[PDB]
Design a protein around this ligand. Structure first.
Ligand SMILES: *CCC(=O)N(c1ccc(C(C)(C)C)cc1)[C@@H](C(=O)NCCc1cccc(F)c1)c1cccnc1
Ligand SMILES: [Cl-]
Lengths: 301, 301
């Protein structure tokens, strides 16, 4: 029993974290095989960040301008290239701790573990979700750039996020490991804002199933709804539309608890229109949307 | 910016997790140097879980009855001893991945990271607190016994908890790494129940300081309180008494934000009285008590 926001064990990723220093800027790098991946804004000075031409700033650098530190050992940079918003530093030593890995781009609603790092040293691990507005509600301070998000599947680490910046509302923006930003963001010192966010409906439903599995049933009712009527309700409360794919994905949880997905939707509709009325669900007074159907199945098995 | 329930990076602990098998029972062990630590209930028979005599059960065992598995390698048991509720299996190989470590016994209110494991294989990492009633609200399924709680300080792992059992209310009970249980619990299937739980007041105050550090001040008021008046109100909401030690411990956070501890106590009294009125504090509609003053200082700017 119990239900916690659980991250993947971070050990396979801790063995890849390095410190990257270029000029006066220090941030984190991900050392996989003989390449260190880090945000390309490490080559930006105070002046550059406003209107940077990264190709022009990179051509002025030599390999020895990038100081890479793996623990107490200096890695020798023997090459450098840019791929989108990610800088790839070729090093002379392959990481002996390189796990089996893939670079994957995740969709909004999907969750992942973040290993927050400072000066190439892992500080903490937490679970978070890619918001529908493409930001993450992370916990990062100055020096956290280059920290990564990942999932683990049968000893294979799927790297999905690299931290680049904080938006004025305190939320975070970054890229996949190929340097493509999640969201309409740029790695520039310019006016940027997170768009209006929405609640990940399939995730709230998954979490309602987790509560049922753990013995919280007060929100269940005899009622059902159509998918279209539920979506007309959901759109009114800033909830993401629920598709037939989400309904199919919730199938296993529905079969285990005996509560049809549209029956759980009528419960969610009532919770949205009435509130929780002094009661809680899995120790929360808010409807939690950062657990996917897979996260619920994984933690309950 | 941001504030998350953050666990320590688990890598140093993942390299210590082994599987311990005794007869038909399989659970987790903690392999440090040439010793494997695990709950002594691994020797307990299914026919007598009510009144086991562990000394009588252990004297009937030989070293070769304990099968220890580290990854895909069998460790050879060369000695065994019981220390309180933990079994210490001397093995022929020292763990090459043994981190720098200490065994620490924590007090209620303290937090730690739990690396949930099954069959000696790490499954997830989450953050917990030792409740005032000495239980932990963990997330553990069958076979999770032997999973450990820990904190990390400058590469030193402080092991503070080993999981032993789930009480009837869904909460968890375990020992420190010397085998002494936290709370009045016993490793017997006898009528045991967690005492009435209370809110960790010093932790809620620390979390209110974290909200002020992150820019939230809506909950503050023009009032102050005496420590005694605060405690008279606190007990009425099932909050733990706030001692002068807690007030002293909150000193650094008080100095950083400019809000005196008793002024923050007046804010907490008001929040208990009025609730949140549709607002959240650090993304929560409840008053969070699983962040210590030390956790807030570690994570916040
Ligand atoms: C690792 C074994 C396990 O999964 N148990 C378990 C722990 C301890 C015992 C005894 C010491 C032999 C009684 C038996 C089984 C799960 C568990 O705690 N089940 C409930 C048994 C129980 C213990 C104490 C009081 C009581 F009333 C009943 C378990 C299940 C989920 C998470 N952790 C452990
Ligand atoms: Cl302590």
């Amino acid at each position: 029993s119990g239900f916690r926001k659980m991250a993947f064990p971070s050990g396979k990723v801790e063995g890849c974290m390095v410190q990257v220093t270029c000029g006066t800027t220090t941030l984190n790098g991900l050392w996989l095989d003989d390449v260190v991946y880090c945000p390309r804004h490490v080559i930006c000075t105070s002046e550059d960040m406003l209107n940077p031409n990264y190709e022009d700033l990179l051509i002025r650098k030599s390999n020895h301008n990038f100081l890479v530190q793996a623990g107490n050992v200096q890695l020798r940079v023997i090459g450098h290239s840019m791929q989108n918003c990610v800088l790839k530093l070729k090093v002379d030593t392959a990481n002996p701790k390189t796990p089996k890995y893939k670079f994957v781009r995740i969709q909004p609603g999907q969750t992942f573990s973040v290993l927050a790092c400072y000066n190439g040293s892992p500080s903490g691990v937490y679970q978070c979700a890619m918001r529908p507005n493409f930001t993450i509600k992370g916990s990062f301070l100055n020096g956290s750039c280059g920290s990564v998000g990942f999932n683990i599947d049968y000893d294979c680490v799927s790297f999905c996020y690299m931290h680049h910046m904080e938006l004025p509302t305190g939320v975070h923006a970054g890229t996949d490991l190929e340097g493509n930003f999640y969201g309409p963001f740029v790695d520039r010192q310019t006016a940027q804002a997170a768009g209006t966010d929405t609640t990940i409906t399939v995730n709230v439903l998954a979490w309602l199933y987790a509560a049922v599995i753990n013995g919280d049933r007060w929100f269940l009712n005899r009622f059902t709804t159509t998918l279209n009527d539920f979506n007309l309700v959901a759109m009114k409360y800033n909830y993401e539309p629920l598709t037939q794919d989400h309904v199919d994905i919730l199938g296993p949880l529905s079969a285990q608890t005996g509560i049809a997905v549209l029956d759980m939707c009528a419960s969610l509709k009532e919770l949205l229109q009435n509130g929780m009325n002094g009661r809680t669900i899995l120790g929360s007074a808010l409807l939690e949307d950062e657990f996917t159907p897979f996260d619920v199945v994984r933690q309950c098995s």
